Amino acid sequence: TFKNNNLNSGDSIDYGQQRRENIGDLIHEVLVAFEKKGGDDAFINIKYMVPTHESSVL
Amino acid sequence: MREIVHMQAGQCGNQIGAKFWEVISDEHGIDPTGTYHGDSDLQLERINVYYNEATGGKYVPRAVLVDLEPGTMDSVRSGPFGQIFRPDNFVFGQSGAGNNWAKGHYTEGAELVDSVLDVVRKEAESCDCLQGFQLTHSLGGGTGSGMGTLLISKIREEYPDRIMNTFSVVPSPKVSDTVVEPYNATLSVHQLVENTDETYCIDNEALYDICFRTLKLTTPTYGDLNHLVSATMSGVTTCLRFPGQLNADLRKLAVNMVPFPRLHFFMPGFAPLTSRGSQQYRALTVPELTQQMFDAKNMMAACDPRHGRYLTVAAIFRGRMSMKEVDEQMLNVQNKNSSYFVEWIPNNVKTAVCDIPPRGLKMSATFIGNSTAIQELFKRISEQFTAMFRRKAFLHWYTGEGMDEMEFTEAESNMNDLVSEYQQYQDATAE
Amino acid sequence: MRECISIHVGQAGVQIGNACWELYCLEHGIQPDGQMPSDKTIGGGDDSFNTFFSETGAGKHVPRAVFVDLEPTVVDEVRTGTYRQLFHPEQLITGKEDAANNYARGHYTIGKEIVDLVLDRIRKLADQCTGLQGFLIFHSFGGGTGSGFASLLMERLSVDYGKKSKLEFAIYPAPQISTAVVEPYNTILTTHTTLEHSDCAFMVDNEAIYDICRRNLDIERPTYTNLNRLIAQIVSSITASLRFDGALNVDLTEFQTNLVPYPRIHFPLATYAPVISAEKAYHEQLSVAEITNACFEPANQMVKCDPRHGKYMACCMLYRGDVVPKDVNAAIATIKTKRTIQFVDWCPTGFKVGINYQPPTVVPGGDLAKVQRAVCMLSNTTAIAEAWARLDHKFDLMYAKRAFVHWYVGEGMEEGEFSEAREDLAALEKDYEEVGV
Amino acid sequence: MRECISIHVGQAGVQIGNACWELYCLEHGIQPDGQMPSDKTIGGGDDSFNTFFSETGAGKHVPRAVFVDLEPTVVDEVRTGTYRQLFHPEQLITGKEDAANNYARGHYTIGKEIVDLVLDRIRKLADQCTGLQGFLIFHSFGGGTGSGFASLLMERLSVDYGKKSKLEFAIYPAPQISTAVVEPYNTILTTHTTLEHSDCAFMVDNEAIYDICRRNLDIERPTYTNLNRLIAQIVSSITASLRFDGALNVDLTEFQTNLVPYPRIHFPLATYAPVISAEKAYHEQLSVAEITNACFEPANQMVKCDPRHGKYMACCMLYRGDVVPKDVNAAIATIKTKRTIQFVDWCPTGFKVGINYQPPTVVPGGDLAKVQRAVCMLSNTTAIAEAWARLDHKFDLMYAKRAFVHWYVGEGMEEGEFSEAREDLAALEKDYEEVGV
Amino acid sequence: GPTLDTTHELRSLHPYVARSIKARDVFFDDHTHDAKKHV
Amino acid sequence: MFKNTFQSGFLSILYSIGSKPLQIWDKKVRNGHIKRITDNDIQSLVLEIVGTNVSTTLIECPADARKTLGIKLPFLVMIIKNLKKYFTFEVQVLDDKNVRRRFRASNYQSTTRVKPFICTMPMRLDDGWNQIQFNLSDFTRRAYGTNYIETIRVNIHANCRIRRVYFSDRLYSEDELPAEFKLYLPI
Amino acid sequence: RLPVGEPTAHMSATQGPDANLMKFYSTSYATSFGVKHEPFVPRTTKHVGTG
Amino acid sequence: QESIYNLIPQEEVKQEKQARYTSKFRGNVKVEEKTKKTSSKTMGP
Amino acid sequence: SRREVYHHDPKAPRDSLDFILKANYDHHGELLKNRSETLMQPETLGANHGRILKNRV
Ligand SMILES: Nc1nc2c(ncn2[C@@H]2O[C@H](COP(=O)(O)OP(=O)(O)OP(=O)(O)O)[C@@H](O)[C@H]2O)c(=O)[nH]1
Ligand SMILES: Nc1nc2c(ncn2[C@@H]2O[C@H](COP(=O)(O)OP(=O)(O)OP(=O)(O)O)[C@@H](O)[C@H]2O)c(=O)[nH]1
Ligand SMILES: Nc1nc2c(ncn2[C@@H]2O[C@H](COP(=O)(O)OP(=O)(O)O)[C@@H](O)[C@H]2O)c(=O)[nH]1
Ligand SMILES: [Mg+2]
């Protein structure tokens, strides 16, 4: 639901990129950490839940 | 291919429209089962105007039936030519207005106008051209007047450009037929002025004398009364359904009569009228047909155009005849009775001619008049309204049904203003 | 190559087109299916049909006509019955809702949905021609489509074409006879477009043709059919010089150059006047001088106006049949020596004579006699000012009290066009009264 | 001598080919069972039906067609219909499980188990023919077998045969009318895998044929039978030069060397004229200039795309009937002297014409008329780029959140194939605007 | 309801009405499956 | 644009360190986001073009159409980060003739398929911070047989973290690069 | 919604009115234009010519 | 060109009306529209 | 004045093909409409065409 809720600021510095309050960013490395420290049958389940995601280990 | 939708409201509207569908099914060859058994193809040639086509040969009417009680529609369904109507077009309630305009317009007709509007919207989107609407009701009843005027208001809100016709069975000067007729008529005319495109004020007493003197007939019966009314409607509408040398539809009729927007109250007239046993002495000519039109005793309202002044006259000759006889008779009747004609409208008669006379008739002729004499009807209604409203007769019903007295005062003011403009255009001169 | 396209607008135009294309089909020997009758091939290279009819395939002729209405019937009546296969299905164009005797409906609301379609049909029929003589528009002033939509068509035709000649035949309201009440309003509103989108304006009064039918043809209750047959006879006599070969004869440009003195004065009067029944034709000297005098009589005009109250500017006399030029010159001499007929001082030679070899043909079930000599006089005079004055008095009488204006204003035209058209007709009246003296 | 092989893939292709072979049998005088009539003789003389048929000895004609669909029914109505005896049983190839509106299921599944069988049948037909001219592959871009197995078969044919013309009739999905929800995905993928294997990709659109049938051909209720009859008329006009003698003989090789400027633009829109109905038909002249103008009208285009928002690259005008090449030259000059019709600045010679002497044959029970002249347009233009823009908008809306992609992934296709196809068709749009500028 | 024939239906009614049905809807007697129909 | 300027050593077009380093580029975003953030690997400002459906989110090198980035330098070097996602870029060049070809290199193609106006080539870049070097002269000599004249436009589509895009004449290996052009990775 | 300027199917697939005056359903157009041609059967043609 | 004196408001003075002509058969029309009319001959009073 | 030989009008098409081509119908996105409105004219719309249609100012 909240995967694509990132900041479309254009060419503008995100000065709040130290408190880490961007859900659209945070979900991405949550999924990357899941796929990395998951297993062989992890991309199929993650792709089954969220259809946009694609593998970081391929 | 120009379709019009027919609505009937109240007892009078239901019986009159039932007779109307009976006669216009007879002239189109539609049997009571709903199929077609006509002689020539001209009967079904323009059948799309009044009938929708079902699967097979079924031709259902383009009609909506409204009454707050099953009642009169129950009688119509259990009468002849009652099986042609779709059962989904019978919209009815449970209570029934007790000749109460407030009940028919605010309390009982309020929670039925949604169903009637859905039926009307469906049956009108089933059309292809949708020339307009015609409604049969009386200005002397509860659901005839209040629910009918509510329907007119909502339909003008929905479709603001279509032609609206009302057939407006007005209260009679003699007898009563209802004791709250001044209230009902004053409240309904106030809606009819600002929401109807053309209105044929029809009087029971005038129809009584027409049916009993010019037709003898002894016992007249509402079958023949409503059939005279239905014959006038057929003569009005016929240029949609049959070809002619000079055709004229509802919009031509309304443009060529109505001079100013709040002057669309007419007097109808059907003028082949032969008493029993005088057809042998009848000559059956165009001058005699026009003379039977332009006779004051042949009007279907109590008002006297000889007392008043004609503004616009529409004559539709439905049958085969000559432009010679027709045009010269209109010119002669105008030039002889130039006293009963406004001088500021030169040759204030529209002429239409069809080609198909009634079955069993050689020629027919419908008469519509827009004289200033019709102010007498509103004067009668307004004076009876004053006599009741001064002593607050029967007003506790209208006030207890959630409706105030300033509605009555505004309705009376509008009717008196209508009489004022009618008298102004009567006595206004050319130069 | 002398084709001219006929447009028939309104109920009056459509009925006149029926009575006119009947006459054309019998004059060219064509059955009401496009084809010639059985074993009645044309032969002899007769190219007379190649002005009103077009070869499509294997001896079929389509008319060069566009029948327009805004409503069904009449056009539907001729689409279904007798002359069913004669016309192309896409040239009898009809609408759904009529213009309701309203110039505003005919010009602004219902007019702008079918005008492009009939213009495209006109363009296709013009492309089918190898050089077009002009257009013949037929309408009544009357109400609705005959005024508003005819105004729209003339307004677009004058900017599309304009090297061609547009002759329009208008059924003018009578002095007292009328089948409507807004005829003065519609006729006033269409005066401007008939002033500035037409080249010749042949105009007819229903009451005058009624009187001619009652007096000459001896029929006592005429319908529209006899009047439309007389209009068809007039138009046939006008275009018979283009159709058939003969003696010295005029064209649609020879006529205009010899008729109209000024661009604003283009409102002549048409009188086809060997009009009689056969029973009285047994007892008449049907001679050239007699029929010329019958044309010049004030009681044989198709507009209820007295030409003795005006001065003749020019007259184009179209003769048909066994007609030599010398008795035509004798008739012109007698007309000149007549003192009742007066001519304007700046037009001394006021006659243009065109003689054609083909006599007119009677339709079966008609009322005209089969005469061997026919004459149509097309005369520009100042007597049409009486019709203008009658129209203006009726319009002023209605417009003083602001009657029926709400229909036009609600349907879309602004208030000022009424006064603008009244001023236009006042200017035309001033022009005619100035040029008369 | 010259021979063509027609492959009808999908339900749309099979029904199209049914109409096409019915028309071919009617115009070559072959009865539906396969024999010629005994008492009647229609074939022979002006015929080269050996380009589309095979003579098996005793007198039966077998068409060179392969009807393929991966679902039994639509092949069994051919197998049990009126034309049951016409087709050899191994020509009508059917599958077991449907492609299910899935490019992945038509490309990487069940069709992979029948591509060998259809290739063997194609090999047998090519061994039978005495010199192959090309293939006519009829299908739709909508989805399933038409977008899937058809593309796979074209790739296999390009690998196996090579250097032969593969003309492709594509039923392109309409801009708004559609009978499926994965049509953008299927059309994107089949365009990507057909763009390098189709020499020509003649585009036909159902909604535009609906427009044609409603306006020109009367018919208030158009259907797939009428659509297939019109497409059969188009392909008969295309292939009539292989079967009848003509002044300008145009075979299947010319369509790729005169309509494909660069090896990416091979999508010419089809247009047929006259498409007049039998009611009007003989009420019009239907001349060469008339049919060419009606062919050049933007409303009479059989792909829902007006040519006024683009410049014409090339135009193949296949004239048929009593057409004279001087008349064709005059018509083409008349269009070339119009400024609203724009041609690209690099192509002064924008027309290739083919004149054929045999008029088209009316189908009994059909809706067209028996006409002499008929022009068929194959117009390559810079206008279908807006259709590609709309279709990439549809693909973008679908693929923004990966709707329906799980089916394509689960039956074989990789995830990146969709993006490859989108990238290549965006490059095709860039190619169109680069050529147009 | 009963099994539809529709040939008897538009044969038992008036010729003008049946002509109108055939003119406006060509599917009232759509008989593609009639030779393969086996009465 | 970029004509009548000295183009000898290097020509930088995008550089995420700056006030407005997208002034000449054209921002088209449909289902993604462009933003400047501080990367955790080089500890400096980096532009990001992350977005699904990579064919829509993209930036052209000219701000508008009908204008050409006239650059005569052959080599194109881009400092890009690997996000293990679909990366795509395109360059339009002018040949010896008047024709303009397009080289489109993407990380999800598999076959180099030469076409008349487009090359459609694949690439397989490593993990972390890659430096894409793209010759254009050998490439236009090998794909069409012409010679490189000038560039027209540069598109970098999506799913990338850009540090610097520039042009150079020769290869310009690591130890002769200037300090600001080096890709420096602190510990 | 039927098109504006075209004949309708119900209008087209009809019989004409009687041209006999002694018939009841006789129009003025029928009785005036076609009273001579009451049992009229129109004859359809075809185009001729070939390449 | 342009000048200071071009900034003077010159207005438009006055545009005439040029009233209608009212043709000479007006009296004849007024006479002939009433030479035949009577008062209540057919309907009666 | 239009019949006068010093008045040539560059509009007013000589051909029916140009007559439909100067219309407003957009074949890519106008849904299933008819011959009456597939050839609608800008003069009928009331656009800013440089054609004098009436003498009225
Ligand atoms: N001579 C002649 N005049 C006719 C005929 N039909 C109608 N008219 C004239 O036309 C007038 C009636 O108005 P129409 O012309 O019918 O109106 P329209 O042109 O059909 O347009 P609408 O208002 O929509 O009916 C009458 O006053 C007649 O003078 C005809 O058949 N013959
Ligand atoms: N012109 C025409 N088009 C058709 C016909 N039948 C189907 N189509 C088109 O085909 C498209 C969809 O493809 P289908 O034919 O239904 O299915 P398919 O191509 O056989 O592929 P499958 O799904 O495997 O059956 C639709 O959008 C239609 O427009 C037809 O008979 N005539
Ligand atoms: N002509 C005629 N008038 C009727 C008929 N039925 C009722 N009326 C009139 O209608 C008036 C009464 O209105 P009513 O029908 O009771 O209205 P409702 O109460 O709203 O249904 C009376 O004046 C009657 O004259 C009828 O069948 N024919
Ligand atoms: Mg009319």
Plain-language structure description:
It is classed as structural protein. This is part of a larger assembly, with nine protein chains of seven kinds. Chain B is α/β, with parallel strands linked by helices and 431 residues long. Helices cover 43% and strands 14% of the residues of chain B. In chain B, strand 4, helix 3 and strand 5 form a beta-alpha-beta unit. In chain B, 57% of the residues are buried. With 437 residues, chain C is of the alpha/beta class. Chain C is built from 15 helices and twelve strands. In chain C, helix 6 crosses helix 13 and helix 6 crosses helix 15. In chain C, 63% of the residues are buried. With 57 residues, chain I is an all-alpha fold. Chain I is built from two helices and no strands. The longest helix of chain I has 6 residues. The two termini of chain I are 17 Å apart. At the B-C interface, helix 10, helix 12 and strand 13 of B face helix 7 and helix 13 of C. The structure holds guanosine-5'-triphosphate (GTP) (2 copies), guanosine-5'-diphosphate and magnesium ion. The site of guanosine-5'-diphosphate (GDP) has 19 residues of chain B, from helix 1, helix 6 and helix 9.
Ligands bound to this protein structure: guanosine-5'-triphosphate, guanosine-5'-diphosphate, magnesium ion
Rg of chain B to the nearest angstrom?
21 Å
Quaternary structure type: part of a larger assembly
Tell me the helix content of chain B. 40-55%
Major beta sheet of chain E, specifics?
A: none
Distance between the termini of chain B: 44 Å
| Largest interface between protein chains, with number of residues from each side | B-C, 41 and 43 residues
Structural class label of chain B: alpha/beta
Share in β-strands of chain E? under 5%
The string of secondary-structure elements of chain B, in order, is EHHEEEHEHHEHEEHEEHHHEHEHEEHHH
Number of helices of chain E: 2
Q: Output the number of helix runs of chain B.
A: 15
Instruction: Estimate the strand proportion of chain B.
Output: 5-15%
Q: Give the topology string of chain E: H per helix, E per strand.
A: HH
User: Within the largest sheet of chain B, what's the order of strands?
Assistant: 5-4-1-6-7-9-11-14-12-13
* Number of E-type strands of chain E: 0
The counted number of beta strands of chain B is 14
- Bulk shape of chain E: globular
Largest sheet of chain B: 10 strands, mixed
PDB class: structural protein
Keywords: doublet microtubule, DMT, microtubule inner protein, cilia, flagella, FAP, cfap, MIP, MAP, cytoskeleton, tublin, TEX, Tektin, saxo
Entry title: atomic model of sea urchin sperm doublet microtubule (48-nm periodicity)
Chain A: pacrg
